[PDB]
Amino acid sequence: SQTLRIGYVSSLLYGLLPEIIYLFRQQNPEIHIELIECGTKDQINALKQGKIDLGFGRLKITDPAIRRIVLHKEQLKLAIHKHHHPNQFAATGVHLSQIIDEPMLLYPVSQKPNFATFIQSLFTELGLVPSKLTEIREIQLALGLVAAGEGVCIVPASAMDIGVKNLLYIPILDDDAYSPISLAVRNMDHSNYIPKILACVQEVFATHHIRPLIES
Amino acid sequence: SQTLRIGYVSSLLYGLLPEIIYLFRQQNPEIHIELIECGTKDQINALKQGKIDLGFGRLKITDPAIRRIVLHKEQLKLAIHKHHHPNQFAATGVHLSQIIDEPMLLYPVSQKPNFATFIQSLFTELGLVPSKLTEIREIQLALGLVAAGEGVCIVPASAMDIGVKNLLYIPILDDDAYSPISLAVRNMDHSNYIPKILACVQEVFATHHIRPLIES
Numbered sequence A, B: 001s002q003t004l005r006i007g008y009v010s011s012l013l014y015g016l017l018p019e020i021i022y023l024f025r026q027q028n029p030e031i032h033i034e035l036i037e038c039g040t041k042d043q044i045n046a047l048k049q050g051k052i053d054l055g056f057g058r059l060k061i062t063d064p065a066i067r068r069i070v071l072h073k074e075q076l077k078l079a080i081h082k083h084h085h086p087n088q089f090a091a092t093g094v095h096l097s098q099i100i101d102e103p104m105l106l107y108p109v110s111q112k113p114n115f116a117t118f119i120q121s122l123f124t125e126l127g128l129v130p131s132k133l134t135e136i137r138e139i140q141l142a143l144g145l146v147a148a149g150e151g152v153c154i155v156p157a158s159a160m161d162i163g164v165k166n167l168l169y170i171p172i173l174d175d176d177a178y179s180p181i182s183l184a185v186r187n188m189d190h191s192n193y194i195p196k197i198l199a200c201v202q203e204v205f206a207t208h209h210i211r212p213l214i215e216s
């Protein structure tokens, strides 16, 4: 009769999160899990109100009532159509300064701060201004539009395996070009699903030769 | 100043549609294209009201005011977690009769008829009743949930390359196990974007050794 509600952002479906949940379900078959689509910002209130218990997000949205556990620093990639700027965009990587006059697809469409405002700030903190920004509802749609020819899109590396054809995923060479994956929990939540889900995290990361940023 | 509004269902982003739009955009750079997320049923009214001009769908939803142009018959696959029923579900394929007591994920959540009711009817027309059905918002989410361990999901073959890890895509051996991709247009629409988009279709299909069901 125990129900664990887990908030997640869409891009995490293409990474190791499904494996983490699968392992948790195997180890804890009595626990009913609800996977709930929820942005990192929206997870704050969702956690505070008891509407979710765990929140897997990608922004450093701090709150005294919330504990953030940083799991992994994922590198960012510029998604482009494979015939776009064969010479200007090297497969070895681009700096953000090179793509300022490209129509950029941001995502998702949601309460802010979110991944769109995060990607914007990467340009901003370098003194750069993208020429055109369009916010798209979800990551896979933004990638579909890149392939349809509506520009470029910065995504986490795990998005490389989203099944949209004819894209290249090019390294972003600037130092701040990472998206941290984190688990948010209520600060005074002492339920054992937290240490349990974290052990699943470390096990799955270990399988993939990833060292969690946090030691168990 | 000409704007072509194109309705599409999500799964088509992992197929040849983005290429078709990209080719059309190259050939017709003056035409502004809006890609609009829209179910096959909802496309009927959208086309009738002039809110879209072209509708790429996956159901035979007929209407006297709408012309349906069937492009491709795509085979269906059962998405499973790679460790689920190693013996019972052969990689060579399953019949729908074999999976009736599996929790099934349907998609999307939308106005009906839709892909969920379509998948249901495949069981129904064989006298079969799935033991549990849960409707999920979108295809990639249903696939994420399969990998998280919430059951199985019938998808078109092109969904095989959606980047969710640890899934197998198993043939469905029953005869009716296909999802037709079609273009819907207003019956009395004589705009040249129709013959133009169809020529793009045939060109892209040709590149991929696919013969359109309709000859140009």
Ligand SMILES: O=C(O)/C=C\C=C/C(=O)O
Pocket: A009, A010, A011, A012, A039, A040, A041, A057, A058, A059, A107, A108, A110, A113, A114, A115, A116, A139
């Ligand atoms: O907006 C956020 O809070 C972060 C990520 C959103 C979507 C994704 O990663 O798919």
Ligand SMILES: O=C(O)/C=C\C=C/C(=O)O
Pocket: B009, B010, B011, B012, B039, B040, B041, B057, B058, B059, B107, B108, B110, B113, B114, B115, B116, B139
């Ligand atoms: O519901 C429909 O009209 C057909 C397909 C829906 C979604 C998809 O293919 O992703």
